[model samples]
Target: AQYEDGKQYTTLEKPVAGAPQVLEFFSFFCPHCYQFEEVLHISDNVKKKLPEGVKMTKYHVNFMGGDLGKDLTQAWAVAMALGVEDKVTVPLFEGVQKTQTIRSASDIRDVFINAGIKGEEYDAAWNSFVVKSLVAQQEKAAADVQLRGVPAMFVNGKYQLNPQGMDTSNMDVFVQQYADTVKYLSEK
Candidate 1:
């Protein structure tokens, strides 16, 4: 494990906090990001291996999906505001990445509707100030981190992981070593 500076990671000017902060920057329209959750299930796998008290946070970036980029970010914020991320995140990813079925705002709304969320509830969350500001926070995070692609990870707000630095022979090995690397980075 040669966790070289500038390769394995690049250090931040200041740490995010006293404790470890694991943040993942992603987009619903990213196919790899979709696979990271569904195909590879990396986030779920890594969560199990993460150290106690270290919670991973996801920030949806607003640079992809064209005009839908900000909309998707807003949608993600709405999901969070409604406390329904676990319910709609995967299907939203599938609709955007796999099915290419999200043609407009209503299609996105339908996903939430199908998830048992009422249309009025969805509308309220979509317009909430909290959700709007959350979208802004996510947009700022993407630019602050200077994200180049989806599924990018930062540990302690300092160590930005280089995916190429990890073992990716297969899903099992990748998940094991990735979780280990993230664990190591968080503790380092």
Candidate 2:
């Protein structure tokens, strides 16, 4: 129901089916994504209020910029294919957000360790081309979306808030209004 548009930034393309789509574009290395963690919970609650098939997905955006983001997206895709995403995503996010250590491979690996993941399994999953390419693909998706920063969100393939689309001044109200938008779109 959600996908990156062949590069780092996401394109926010219209869904193929009728069900409404909600996509949050973010980066594990970015602190804002951690700050928006509560938003994820809120989004989940909003989703629970909706009918089946009205759902949301995420693009773990790459911040290296240029081809680096592209490469990381491909890496993310590889992890998704291998079913080791939980190993890669969770630890990496924690490493970045909790520790603020977004330096090197070992640093990220430390995150894996902190999340209770085995180092061997983490390394095997990380080195695979599948994970690399998948992450790179997401990098491209993030690049395409033209996001201002980490923790940006999109609804129905367009800018529903945050510097575009909405005229409201308050962010919380803007988000609530967008949730209403999701409710409305699901029935269409």
Candidate 3:
């Protein structure tokens, strides 16, 4: 594997049952993460390589040291709650990374609307207590893991599989390595 066992990724906690979880920590405004999105969308290859019960998830990091980070995190959490993350993630990255059009929470809401989310549904999901609390919890999770930056990955909540150290030129190989490593760890 291209990734080191301990230096590349470290154990943070125990694995959750039912599936071997892969949680991706990212930020909408992060350029590296914007690039990482391409890797993320090649999900079929990674999915095919994962063990039968392994599942991957995304966690928006809220340690941006500014409100933009916090706002985007909340927006992501809301989209997740609405079951629209799969639909929103790409557009969001494009909006910020390419068009440079997303600036406020309202702009985010418009993106959701354009993506077909109902206005009322957006309002409730955006302002709901559950969404608010979940955002807070996500922020805590990032802090708990001592996340230093975006585009980090955590395996089963216990192991942090950071791809930052890998060769960026060969994403296909790097992704395969990540899946192979996860499979190896999951079997243990």
Candidate 4:
């Protein structure tokens, strides 16, 4: 499961208890999010071997897509259904980087299909209620957390807002570093 349930910060979900929760807030249009893509890949591989509890979840901040909230929600929901949510993360980032036009539902779907996801499933779930509702929840969660940036993150709720003096320009270093910090916290 994704880190911290995306909202209920204190609760630890099943199969990942006592493991680190890495929450990454991102926007498709944000340059920082794009730059941070590389770091996410490296961290994903590392986090995978950390027993079963430690994991990372990325949330769309919804600053770009015409209906970004809806799009983000739909995207994540589709991944949940396919059981390849994590698999799609890096590809999604690559789609944005490989093109100038985003927010296009068609293009987004194409990205999924290219990454080995079924085209039919992608379309059906792209606008499903599950996706729309989750998107709304994402917007709500962002507001509830008082987040104002595209790549804001929290590591097991212990570190939020500031990265304890880490470099902000390099999104990967910052994100992966924080994930490591959370891993350390969980071990303690």
Expressed as tens digits, the lDDT of each residue in 23-98 for candidate 3 is 6678887887777675444344556777776776677886662777788888888887888887898888888788
Expressed as tens digits, the lDDT of each residue in 1-188 for candidate 1 is 47677766667776555423888878888877877888787778778888888887888887787878878888989988888989998889888877889878889999999999999989998988999899888877766766778778888778877777666768788777777778888788
Q: By how many angstroms RMSD does model 1 differ from the true structure?
A: 2.0
Which ranges in model 2 have alpha carbons more than 4 Å from their true place? 1-20, 38-40, 64-94, 163-178, 185-188
Residue lDDT tens for model 2, 19-130: 1266667665556555555333435555766677656766766554444344445445545665665566755655556665645555555655665667777667767776
- A best-first ranking of the candidates according to their lDDT comes to 1, 3, 4, 2
Give the TM-score of each candidate. 0.91, 0.60, 0.84, 0.66
Q: Please list the residue runs of candidate 4 whose C-alpha ends up more than 4 Å from where it truly belongs after superposition.
A: 1-20, 39-52, 65-70, 101-103, 167-177, 184-188
Question: What ordering of candidates by TM-score runs from best to worst?
Answer: 1, 3, 4, 2
Candidate 2 matches the true fold with a TM-score of 0.60
For candidate 4, write residues 23-119 as lDDT tens digits.
6677666666665555455345436544566567566776565575456556766776567766777667766665554456676677688788887
Instruction: Report the backbone clash tally of model 3.
Output: 2
lDDT winner between candidates 2 and 4: 4
In order, the Cα lDDT scores of the candidates are: 0.81, 0.55, 0.73, 0.60
Tell me which of candidates 3 and 4 scores higher on TM-score: 3
The local lDDT score (0 to 100) that residue 173 gets in candidate 4 is 64
Top-lDDT candidate index: 1
Name the weakest run of 10 consecutive residues (lDDT summed) in model 1. Answer: 11-20
Superposed Cα deviation of residue 88, candidate 3 (Å): 0.7
